[PDB]
Design a protein around this ligand. Sequence first.
Ligand code: MMG
Length: 285
Amino acid sequence: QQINLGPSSNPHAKPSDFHFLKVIGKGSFGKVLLARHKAEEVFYAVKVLQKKAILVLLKNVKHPFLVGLHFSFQTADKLYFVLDYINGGELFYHLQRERCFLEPRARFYAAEIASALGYLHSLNIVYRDLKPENILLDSQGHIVLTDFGLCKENIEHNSTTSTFCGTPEYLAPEVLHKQPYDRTVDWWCLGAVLYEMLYGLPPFYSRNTAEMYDNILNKPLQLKPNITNSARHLLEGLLQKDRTKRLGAKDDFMEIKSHVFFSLINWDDLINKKITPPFNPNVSG
Ligand SMILES: O=C(O)c1ccc(-c2c[nH]c3ncc(-c4ccccc4)cc23)cc1
């Protein structure tokens, strides 16, 4: 009954190695807990998924902007995954406190997310459902995305939706049409994150969920005149409804990488964290 977890697997690790403090959060499946390793005396985030949710399950990818996986293990009923505890706060918590970001700062976060997505696509992996709840900052103020390689397609999601005030997600037109997830959905999500970073609300927003779905599919893009033309151009490109016309359809990350909005970004410097972040979270750990 032992599930194959991959190279990260730990035959020696048991739950009794961990002090479990509180519930950190919940994605689309399972739960995440704050845990202090009894012996090691350090803090981790342990995702715990129940075996009665699986209908190669884990394919971890290392990258400077993807949350690090330390090891994984299992019991009779549950699977456990030990991750870095990221204490710089959720990106959108900082956005909340500020209403919106200036473009240079928004650009920096968008660039880090873009590089991780572009890296993932090169290894033939698609993010699928990038959401604000997935976007954290580390102690230094660099972006950390919470996906660590779990196969979403093989795990049963818990996803009903409310008519008013749903879970914050960026559903692309093609996702609503329930068409295969490909690399161009990730670019729609990038554009939506960038849109929200600039305007303080997701694009096509409505209090009513159905209205929002309606707006995503049928309402033309609304770009108020408070951003530079390069920002406008990028958002017009990334938030195309037709994914065959969308920025990234023909050359993927190279189209975003070479876009005028990111002209001031040295992509080698960024990926290697040589650019001092535009904001320092008021903590260290
Ligand atoms: O798949 C998922 O739902 C998932 C997988 C990993 C995480 C996660 C890994 N490390 C973390 N560190 C901190 C926090 C955190 C701390 C305070 C407030 C909110 C989040 C979350 C994580 C989260 C979700």
